Design a protein around this ligand. Structure first.
Ligand code: 2Y5
Length: 401
């Protein structure tokens, strides 16, 4: 098996965790606390986000669907499909260093490409932004991940205040603007850390809203007197408050839709997570990557994890963490603050805290859009870094004038 699917929490590891908890007080921030390497998957958070994007076929179905209601369902299908793409063991992504970046691409079966660009925009508190686009299909995705980790006793939680904005550039609304979907994230809980075994749960409410429809999906939480893990329930409505469908089932098994105009009918299969197959992103080889590009930067750490050598993993991890600490001290001494290389700060009225700095006009030719994307950062094999890359986003935006 892969190390991501192997629980490495034996008697020794459980002692390390229990010991850390001993010094903790309920409500504590877990962001400022170094955690053992045996609960780490071999990915940065920047790459973990791409897991959720491994079903572009559903997204392509949505964009191609003419019926508004069915288009919404296909969007909901695309988004729900990615959550089971995760380690089977209770493990978490690496906490990306400040200014860390990650790029990847997809070779789509319709012989088009999908491009992905991301950057860790903040460390205290941790936060990252990502850009995703399939220009030849007029599909654009912008998002941020904002984890707020807390110790709560027998439970620890990562409250997810991030969100994702999906746009169909060639599908206009009542304003002439591209059809926009806003998708929030459920919270990630870990239970049974004190007494018993550890298990990861998704909880609370996920919202998906379009110009015409809206869906409040609840990720139900398992109780003591039971039962069932991983259950969801929600409704698809228009803004007149009319209910069209009910979603049910399990986000890691099979999810169903029940047509509410047929009150006697039984919920039919909406998404089988065992049926369709995920499409993994492609990445440049290490020999082309930058010093603080995710996979290269963490290479020594992931190598050690891949063979379960934790003394070495913790050591290599510490070196990286300690260097960043040094850099933070130097910034204070020089009287400067960090500025993202690839993402600008939000303007008033926008949906996200960060947005890709490159201006990509809505009704521009897809070929020229791809050209603009490739100028942002090295994505495809053979692409070369430039001096412009390391210039802060806000300076690059000051330019173009
Ligand atoms: C009390 C012990 C509990 C042990 C449990 C063990 C494992 C549970 C595994 C899964 C998570 C489960 C639930 C979450 C519950 C609470 C635990 C949160 C875990 C957590 O705070 O890690 C922390 C990092 O901050 C995240 O990493 C925040 C990221 C949180 C990751 C969870 C999110 C996973 C789901 C991702 C889905 C993505 C959604 C995609 C959105 C849709 C896209 C379309 C700490 O770790 P760490 O040593 O790598 O981080 C270090 C950091 O590397 C170092 O530089 C810092 O030094 P300084 O501070 O001196 O510089 C140091 O303070 C510390 O930050």
């Amino acid at each position: 098996i892969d190390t991501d699917d192997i629980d490495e929490d034996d008697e020794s590891g459980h002692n390390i965790i229990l010991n850390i908890i001993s010094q903790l007080r309920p409500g504590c921030d877990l962001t400022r606390i170094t955690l053992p390497t045996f609960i780490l998957e071999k990915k940065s958070m920047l790459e973990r986000v791409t897991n959720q994007l491994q079903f572009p076929e559903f997204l392509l179905q949505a964009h191609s669907e003419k019926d508004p209601l069915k288009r919404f369902l296909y969007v909901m299908k695309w988004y729900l499909a990615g959550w089971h793409i995760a380690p089977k063991a209770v493990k978490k992504p690496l906490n990306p260093v400040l200014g860390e970046y990650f790029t990847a691409y997809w070779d789509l079966p319709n012989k088009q490409q999908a491009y992905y660009i991301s950057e860790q925009t903040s460390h205290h508190p941790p936060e990252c932004a990502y850009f995703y686009m399939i220009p030849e299909s007029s599909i654009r995705v912008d998002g941020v991940v904002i984890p707020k980790s807390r110790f709560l006793g027998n439970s620890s939680a990562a409250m997810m205040d991030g969100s994702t904005v999906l746009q169909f550039l060639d599908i206009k609304d009542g304003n002439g603007k591209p059809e926009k979907y806003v998708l929030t994230q459920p919270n990630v809980y870990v239970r049974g850390i004190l007494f018993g075994k550890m298990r990861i749960e998704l909880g609370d409410h996920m919202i998906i809203k379009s110009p015409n429809f809206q869906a409040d999906i609840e990720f139900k939480t398992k109780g003591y007197v039971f039962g069932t893990y991983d259950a969801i329930e929600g409704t698809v409505k228009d803004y007149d408050g009319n209910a069209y469908y009910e979603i049910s089932g399990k986000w890691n098994d099979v999810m169903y839709l029940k047509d509410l105009k047929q009150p006697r009918s039984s919920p039919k299969v909406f998404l089988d997570t065992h049926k369709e197959s995920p499409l993994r992103p492609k990445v440049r080889p290490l020999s082309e990557q930058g010093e603080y590009e995710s996979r290269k930067l963490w290479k020594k750490v992931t190598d050690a994890l891949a063979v379960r050598n934790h003394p070495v993993a913790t050591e290599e991890k510490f070196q990286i963490e300690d260097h960043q600490r040094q850099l933070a001290k130097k910034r204070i001494e020089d009287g400067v603050e960090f500025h993202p290389k690839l993402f600008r700060r939000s303007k008033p009225g926008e949906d996200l805290d960060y947005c890709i700095y490159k201006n990509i006009p809505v009704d521009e030719d897809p070929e020229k859009q791809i050209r603009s994307i490739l100028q942002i950062a090295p994505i495809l094999p053979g692409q070369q870094f430039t001096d412009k890359f390391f210039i802060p986003a806000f300076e690059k935006i000051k330019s173009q004038k």
